[PDB]
Amino acid sequence: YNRMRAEREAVARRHRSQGQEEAEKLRATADYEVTRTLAEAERQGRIMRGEGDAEA
Amino acid sequence: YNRMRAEREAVARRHRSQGQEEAEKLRATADYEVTRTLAEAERQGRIMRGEGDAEA
Amino acid sequence: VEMNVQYRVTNPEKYLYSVTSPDDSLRQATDSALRGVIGKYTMDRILTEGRTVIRSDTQRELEETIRPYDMGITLLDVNFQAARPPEEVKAAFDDAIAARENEQ
Amino acid sequence: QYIREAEAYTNEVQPRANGQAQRILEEARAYKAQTILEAQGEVARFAKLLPEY
């Protein structure tokens, strides 16, 4: 009895493993996109500040 | 049951965030205008303080 | 999903000397017809168009299925007294539906 | 369920980043107007004091 139970419990665990794996794989790329979006605006702001300094 | 619940709460919080986005978007213009008008006022004040100092 | 039926007897002798205990046959075949209609359509569609698309089909299927039994009754119609498709366990789309107004 | 939750997290984390980006850009724009108006004020104030000297 215990043998059979352990076997199919292991099956269930491996399924849940692939699930969680794909979960973090997507979560990482989300944060990548966030950081790129912030960096672009940082560049733009630096440009504008430089223009103001030149005029002054 | 729980699967349904998860999908449904996900849609709800999606609408939450979608509104809050342009909600926060719109405040930047107001802050820009208030800063600009205060800067103009400061310019005029400096000009006429200079008048006073020169005559003194 | 829930519904309701109205029925009428034309030929009494078929109502007597045929399949016995009429309300048993009526109700206990209507359930099967209701399953037959409700099956094929998706959850959202059942939520939205519960009063047009499904009811005529349940009419046709129930009228068809009562035919071979050769009992004597003629259907008035079927109506939609109430609709409560979200299950009672988690009827908490009130948040999901109040979300749009809270967003606006 | 895990897959759906994960794929939902993207659209609930990214628009906030867009909002922050617009806030940053607007503040950057405001800085320029402030500094140029202040510079004009300072130059005009000094130009009148010099002939008093």
Curated annotation (Swiss-Prot), chains A, B:
Origin: domain of life: Bacteria
Compartment list: Cell inner membrane
Cysteine-cysteine disulfides: none
The family this protein is said to belong to: Belongs to the band 7/mec-2 family. HflC subfamily.
UniProt function note: HflC and HflK help govern the stability of phage lambda cII protein, and thereby control the lysogenization frequency of phage lambda. HflKC inhibits the SecY-degrading activity of FtsH, possibly helping quality control of integral membrane proteins.
Subunit details: HflC and HflK interact to form a complex, originally called HflA, now called HflKC. HflKC interacts with FtsH; complex formation is stimulated by ATP, and with YccA.
Protein name per UniProt: Modulator of FtsH protease HflC
Organism: Escherichia coli (strain K12)
Lineage per the UniProt record: Bacteria, Pseudomonadati, Pseudomonadota, Gammaproteobacteria, Enterobacterales
Gene behind this protein: hflC
Residue numbers of the full-length protein present here: 224 to 279 of 334
Swiss-Prot record, chain C:
Annotated compartments: Cell inner membrane
Superkingdom per UniProt: Bacteria
Main function: HflC and HflK help govern the stability of phage lambda cII protein, and thereby control the lysogenization frequency of phage lambda. HflKC inhibits the SecY-degrading activity of FtsH, possibly helping quality control of integral membrane proteins.
Note: Integration of this protein into the membrane depends on SecA, SecY and SecD but not on SecB or FtsY. HflK is unstable in the absence of HflC.
Oligomer status and interactors: HflC and HflK interact to form a complex, originally called HflA, now called HflKC. HflKC interacts with FtsH; complex formation is stimulated by ATP, and with YccA.
Family from the record: Belongs to the band 7/mec-2 family. HflK subfamily.
Protein name: Modulator of FtsH protease HflK
Lineage: Bacteria, Pseudomonadati, Pseudomonadota, Gammaproteobacteria, Enterobacterales
